[PDB]
Amino acid sequence: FSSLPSYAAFATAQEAYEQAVANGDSEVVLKKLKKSLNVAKSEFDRDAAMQRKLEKMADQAMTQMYKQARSEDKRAKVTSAMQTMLFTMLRKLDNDALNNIINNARDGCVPLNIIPLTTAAKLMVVIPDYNTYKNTCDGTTFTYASALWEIQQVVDADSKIVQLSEISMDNSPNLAWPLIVTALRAN
């Protein structure tokens, strides 16, 4: 608070005070100078106090509304991300089998658990040990869920290609045993 009307009033009051003090006038002159100093101090009170609070409230408003703008921009970004994710996941499912099996439904509404059970084009099987692998996925192909499945690629826990020949009784303890087998819908 430097360029204020109360600053000018106090400056001129102090100029009068110092001038009449260096002059060395009567005691009433000194009392008048004291009164002028007072009233100018009164004037300078609000003009150096109110503006500080006004600046503080303006600054907090600026912070708040800047934050509001930032929030809305983030909202737009997230909306765009969500819709593009939807539209990009959607375009890899529409087999004619889906329409086929929805038409046979009495009103369209079918249980969810059957859609991958009938329309999925790839199957992953997780195998704990060789005993289980023996009577489930023996041979290059096998059947499950009333359909034929042909085995394409088999990986171990460390994601390493394992040949089906290597999978045997004697060779069993030489592999990690969350075995993963992925297959295609053989037809």
Binding residues for another protein (CB under 8 A): 50, 52-75, 78
> Judging by beta carbons within 10 Å of its beta carbon (0-12, 13-18, 19+), is residue 131 exposed, middle or buried?
exposed
CB of 54 to another protein, least distance (A): 5
Please say which residue, 79 or 153, places its beta carbon nearer to another protein: 79
- CB count within 10 Å of CB 18 equals 11
Please say which residue, 31 or 56, places its beta carbon nearer to RNA: 31
Please say which residue, 28 or 161, places its beta carbon nearer to RNA: 28
CB of 27 to RNA, least distance (A): 5
Please say which residue, 50 or 148, places its beta carbon nearer to another protein: 50
Q: Which does 72 bind (CB under 5 to 8 A by kind): another protein, RNA, none?
A: another protein
CB of 173 to RNA, least distance (A): 41
Q: Which does 160 bind (CB under 5 to 8 A by kind): another protein, RNA, none?
A: none
* Contacting residues for 179 by C-beta, under 8 A, at least 6 apart: 126, 127, 128, 133, 154, 155, 156, 162, 167
Q: Structure tokens of 4?
A: 């204020």
Q: Taking a C-beta distance cutoff of 8 angstroms, is the pair 181, 125 a contact?
A: yes
Helices 27-47 and 50-89, axial angle in degrees (round to 10): 10
Tokens 């009392």, located at residue: 31
Q: Structure tokens of 135?
A: 């009577």
Q: Which does 58 bind (CB under 5 to 8 A by kind): another protein, RNA, none?
A: another protein
**Interacting residues toward RNA by CB under 7 A:** 27-28, 31, 42, 45-46, 49-50
CB of 39 to RNA, least distance (A): 10
Q: Which does 45 bind (CB under 5 to 8 A by kind): RNA, another protein, none?
A: RNA
Q: Taking a C-beta distance cutoff of 8 angstroms, is the pair 154, 180 a contact?
A: yes
Please say which residue, 68 or 153, places its beta carbon nearer to another protein: 68
Q: Which does 65 bind (CB under 5 to 8 A by kind): another protein, RNA, none?
A: another protein
Strand order, beta sheet including 179-186: 122-127, 179-186, 148-155, 141-143
